[PDB]
Amino acid sequence: QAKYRHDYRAPDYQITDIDLTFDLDAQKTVVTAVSQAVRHGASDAPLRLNGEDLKLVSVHINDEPWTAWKEEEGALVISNLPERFTLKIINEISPAANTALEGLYQSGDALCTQCEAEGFRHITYYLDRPDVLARFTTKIIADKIKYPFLLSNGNRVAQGELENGRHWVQWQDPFPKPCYLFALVAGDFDVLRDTFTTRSGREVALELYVDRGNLDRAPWAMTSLKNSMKWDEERFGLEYDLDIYMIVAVDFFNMGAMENKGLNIFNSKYVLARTDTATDKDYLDIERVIGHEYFHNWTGNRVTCRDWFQLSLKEGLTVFRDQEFSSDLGSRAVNRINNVRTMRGLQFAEDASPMAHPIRPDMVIEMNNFYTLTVYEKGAEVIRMIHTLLGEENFQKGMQLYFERHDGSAATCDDFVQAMEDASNVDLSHFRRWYSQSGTPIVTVKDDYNPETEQYTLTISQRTPATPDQAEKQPLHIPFAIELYDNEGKVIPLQKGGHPVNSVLNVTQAEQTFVFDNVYFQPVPALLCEFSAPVKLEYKWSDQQLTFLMRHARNDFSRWDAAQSLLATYIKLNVARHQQGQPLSLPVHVADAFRAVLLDEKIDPALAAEILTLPSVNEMAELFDIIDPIAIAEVREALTRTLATELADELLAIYNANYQSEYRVEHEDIAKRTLRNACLRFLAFGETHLADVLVSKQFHEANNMTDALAALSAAVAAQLPCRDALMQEYDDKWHQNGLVMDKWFILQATSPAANVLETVRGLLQHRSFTMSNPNRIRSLIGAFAGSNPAAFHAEDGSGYLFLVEMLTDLNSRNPQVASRLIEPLIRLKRYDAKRQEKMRAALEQLKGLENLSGDLYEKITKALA
Ligand SMILES: [Zn+2]
Numbered sequence: 001q002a003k004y005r006h007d008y009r010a011p012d013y014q015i016t017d018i019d020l021t022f023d024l025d026a027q028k029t030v031v032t033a034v035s036q037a038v039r040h041g042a043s044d045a046p047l048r049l050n051g052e053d054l055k056l057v058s059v060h061i062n063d064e065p066w067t068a069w070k071e072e073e074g075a076l077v078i079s080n081l082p083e084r085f086t087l088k089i090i091n092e093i094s095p096a097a098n099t100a101l102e103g104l105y106q107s108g109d110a111l112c113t114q115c116e117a118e119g120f121r122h123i124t125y126y127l128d129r130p131d132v133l134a135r136f137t138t139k140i141i142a143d144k145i146k147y148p149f150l151l152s153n154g155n156r157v158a159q160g161e162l163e164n165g166r167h168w169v170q171w172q173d174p175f176p177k178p179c180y181l182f183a184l185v186a187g188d189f190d191v192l193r194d195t196f197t198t199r200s201g202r203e204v205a206l207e208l209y210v211d212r213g214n215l216d217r218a219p220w221a222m223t224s225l226k227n228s229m230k231w232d233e234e235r236f237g238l239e240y241d242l243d244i245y246m247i248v249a250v251d252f253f254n255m256g257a258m259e260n261k262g263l264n265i266f267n268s269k270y271v272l273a274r275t276d277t278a279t280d281k282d283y284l285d286i287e288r289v290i291g292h293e294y295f296h297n298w299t300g301n302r303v304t305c306r307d308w309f310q311l312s313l314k315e316g317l318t319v320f321r322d323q324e325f326s327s328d329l330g331s332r333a334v335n336r337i338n339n340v341r342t343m344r345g346l347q348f349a350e351d352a353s354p355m356a357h358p359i360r361p362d363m364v365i366e367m368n369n370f371y372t373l374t375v376y377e378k379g380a381e382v383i384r385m386i387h388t389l390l391g392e393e394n395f396q397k398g399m400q401l402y403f404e405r406h407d408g409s410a411a412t413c414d415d416f417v418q419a420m421e422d423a424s425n426v427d428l429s430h431f432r433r434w435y436s437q438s439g440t441p442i443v444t445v446k447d448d449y450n451p452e453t454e455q456y457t458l459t460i461s462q463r464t465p466a467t468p469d470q471a472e473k474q475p476l477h478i479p480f481a482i483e484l485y486d487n488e489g490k491v492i493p494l495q496k497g498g499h500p501v502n503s504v505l506n507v508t509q510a511e512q513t514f515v516f517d518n519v520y521f522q523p524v525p526a527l528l529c530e531f532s533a534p535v536k537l538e539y540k541w542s543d544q545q546l547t548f549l550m551r552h553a554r555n556d557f558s559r560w561d562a563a564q565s566l567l568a569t570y571i572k573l574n575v576a577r578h579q580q581g582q583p584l585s586l587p588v589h590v591a592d593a594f595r596a597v598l599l600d601e602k603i604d605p606a607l608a609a610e611i612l613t614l615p616s617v618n619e620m621a622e623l624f625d626i627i628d629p630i631a632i633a634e635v636r637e638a639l640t641r642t643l644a645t646e647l648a649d650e651l652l653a654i655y656n657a658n659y660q661s662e663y664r665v666e667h668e669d670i671a672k673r674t675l676r677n678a679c680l681r682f683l684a685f686g687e688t689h690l691a692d693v694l695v696s697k698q699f700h701e702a703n704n705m706t707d708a709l710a711a712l713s714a715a716v717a718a719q720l721p722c723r724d725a726l727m728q729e730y731d732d733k734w735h736q737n738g739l740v741m742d743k744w745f746i747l748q749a750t751s752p753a754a755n756v757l758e759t760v761r762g763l764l765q766h767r768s769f770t771m772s773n774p775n776r777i778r779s780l781i782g783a784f785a786g787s788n789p790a791a792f793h794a795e796d797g798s799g800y801l802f803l804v805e806m807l808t809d810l811n812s813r814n815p816q817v818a819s820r821l822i823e824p825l826i827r828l829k830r831y832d833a834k835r836q837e838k839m840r841a842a843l844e845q846l847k848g849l850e851n852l853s854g855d856l857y858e859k860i861t862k863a864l865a
Contacts, residue, residue: 012041110187316379
């Protein structure tokens with residue numbers, strides 16, 4: 001049932017225009033689709049239309065009832081057609097019965113759609129493939145009282161009233177598009193309207209639709225949209241191309257958001273915010289996602305994907321764009337740090353799992369299973385490597401050539417690389433292998449300083465371990481950025497033979513040496529600067545080299561990275577000790593390094609905050625071949641407690657110094673607050689009474705949700721006396737707000753308490769929880785299985801049994817959310833034999849489920865192989 005990239009073949013038929021009519025009703029919606037088709041293939045080829053769960057009413061060709069057709073599994077095959085003709089299909093669908101949230105479905109009282117990857121075929125029989133671009137016109141007919149707003153892509157070109165309290169609106173989107181970009185929304189909303197005038201003077205009407213009563217949480221998203229539009233103009237020279245830009249925030253949505261042309265549909269978590277309900281993180285995430293979907297207007301919509309194996313063509317590039325947007329507007333160092341934590345702690349884990357795949361997949365069973373950390377985040381790292389090799393100027397020339405050549409078409413990853421190569425004259429032939437090879441490369445570095453010749457030599461090797469999907473691995477073109485520092489922290493000019501050498505080394509062979517002369521003093525190297533390539537670095541650092549970099553490295557990312565390498569050594573040491581029943585051991589000079597960060601009056605608070613944020617349990621897991629989740633969790637707490645004790649006075653001093661009476665969603669303020677709360681994490685583990693008072697005080701005195709949640713999280717993390725009271729107070733105050741309660745469910749699910757599973761199971765009956773909402777599911781069940789590996793991997797196997805129960809429900813209800821939740825279970829080979837046995841048993845139980853979804857089937861099969 002798997003489909004392969006190498007089987008791509010141009011369509012036998014194209015549809016150039018489609019006129020849709022929806023007679024809307026939650027129980028029974030009637031769809032009438034009139035398509036203008038043109039044959040491109042053999043004259044005897046039948047037209048094969050994709051369709052899922054549709055009730056066919058009639059088929060006409062040029063108004064003639066058609067008798068030469070047959071329905072087969074997932075398709076409508078029409079034979080003996082003319083070269084050009086008008087196809088008319090009438091079918092019925094039932095939005096209310098759509099619990100998978102794919103196609104046209106119900107979200108609360110509203111009706112909305114999600115068509116990517118292949119959801120449009122759940123609406124009508126069509127050429128549901130992205131290389132078929134048609135001009136859409138959409139007429140919507142519905143009850144006026146229940147659905148006063150009827151929206152689709154483009155501009156409103158017609159509207160009217162009908163008998164029996166019904167009305168209609170017709171939309172026209174002039175830009176040809178693949179059907180995955182089709183969108184329809186119907187319902188009653190509050191609307192925030194604003195305007196943005198492009199650089200050339202185009203006035204764009206901005207409209208943000210939210211559920212009634214949510215207007216007080218819409219301004220930030222609107223502000224972010226305008227910021228996104230302005231930034232794309234300034235940085236990429238791109239302007240919006242339509243007259244209106246609509247965004248609809250819905251409560252039931254499997255994805256974070258969707259870039260439907262001129263009518264984006266967003267999961268409300270990435271839209272709604274006000275100071276008492278949203279944290280600094282929420283604000284920055286809303287900025288990131290609003291920008292992301294907007295950036296897709298060019299990288300995804302004006303230039304789309306030829307086939308789904310090319311998904312990264314738009315996702316990797318658009319993620320790169322949203323990272324550059326966030327970085328330009330805020331702290332580049334903090335953004336880079338956050339994105340590298342995601343790569344090392346989450347994406348590396350995926351590349352080391354049964355689901356490993358190159359950013360451009362070669363084999364797919366269920367395409368929705370490929371909207372991954374790999375396709376998105378590693379995809380962006382690959383785009384960033386191109387940027388690193390070309391430089392901003394040539395990168396932009398590449399973007400320009402890409403649009404000149406492919407604007408208005410469906411392209412491939414190769415087309416993009418070719419545009420970059422042609423515009424810059426930089427050979428990316430070898431570089432292309434990054435698109436075809438899965439797994440994380442390991443770069444080993446050995447060095448030598450020769451005082452006799454004053455030369456520094458780097459011997460660099462690379463290798464990518466085989467993965468389940470590929471037995472063959474080859475060397476890649478790895479941009480390896482370096483910087484050399486003398487004893488005083490000054491940069492040593494890179495040169496050889498009297499000629500300067502670029503700091504970005506081209507590591508293209510299995511092994512090679514790089515010689516630098518005129519190195520008058522033994523240098524301390526900064527390697528893989530700014531995480532120049534998505535690889536694991538193996539270099540025999542001395543603790544002093546690392547603390548030296550923490551104090552002298554020019555780029556703040558290097559300082560944080562050095563601290564990570566320093567901590568890695570001792571996290572590994574102490575996990576081994578834990579398995580031997582021994583307590584934490586840490587050399588004095590290590591605690592000294594963090595004390596120095598706290599007392600450094602010149603360091604950016606933004607950087608200090610990240611250095612003082614210990615790697616997560618998932619980040620820590622990637623430092624080990626075989627994961628011991630319990631040892632990792634206990635060591636993380638022990639490390640927190642030790643630093644809390646050794647730095648008690650300094651932590652409190654910095655906590656107080658960064659107090660801010662005014663709350664501002666401004667980067668300098670966010671940095672100080674992030675630092676203050678980073679200190680709070682440690683202070684929560686100080687003398688019980690002292691910690692309990694400090695934490696309870698912040699929760700009650702907080703004038704924003706960032707500080708309130710930080711305090712609540714600390715109470716849970718340290719199991720402080722005030723915990724139960726604060727948690728109940730939060731529940732009583734916010735139970736009616738799902739997005740706010742999600743933070744609470746996450747805290748319950750990731751609690752270090754011994755009875756966490758019992759609590760989580762009980763919360764399935766909580767008034768704020770429901771299996772019908774993906775956000776609730778992910779915040780409670782997903783957080784438990786994926787963010788509390790220590791509890792999920794309880795030795796008795798209770799965690800696996802719980803997940804099996806939940807997946808048994810979700811497999812039938814919502815396969816996509818079920819597939820997101822099964823990920824922790826497919827990582828079984830990273831655990832001990834006893835755990836593997838229990839996890840395999842759990843997977844075998846799921847494998848035998850009646851009506852097993854393709855989504856789960858694909859992952860279960862790979863995990864059990
Ligand atoms: Zn995207």
